[PDB]
Amino acid sequence: IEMAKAQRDYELKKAAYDIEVNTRRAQADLAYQLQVAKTKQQIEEQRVQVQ
């Protein structure tokens, strides 16, 4: 019984921490695409100004 008590006490916190780390990693992965699009805005703004 106490075995399962400790198993819960460990697993629940591990999952709760995993939620936060997964959210932050998901944000970090797509920050690159967000910025590259934001600067491709100006890239295209000038690549059409030449026209």
Binding site: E11, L12, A15, I19, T23, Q27, L34, A37, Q41, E44
Partner: protein, 54 residues
């Protein structure tokens, strides 16, 4: 005694499985939330382009 142990273990497994099931899909939730802005800018690309095609 076996019944008591099995009942407690299943009860614990309930919330541990609930918390895990949240854990895998938090990734997809945040991914979609970020893809919102990702696609917002990816589509503002051609908005800016067509603005000066004028």
């Amino acid at each position: 005694s076996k019944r008591a142990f099995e009942l407690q273990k299943s009860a614990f497994s309930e919330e541990v499985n609930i918390k895990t099931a949240e854990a895998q899909l938090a990734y997809e939730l945040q991914g979609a939330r970020e893809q919102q802005k990702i696609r917002q800018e990816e589509i503002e690309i051609e908005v800016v382009q067509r603005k000066k095609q004028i």
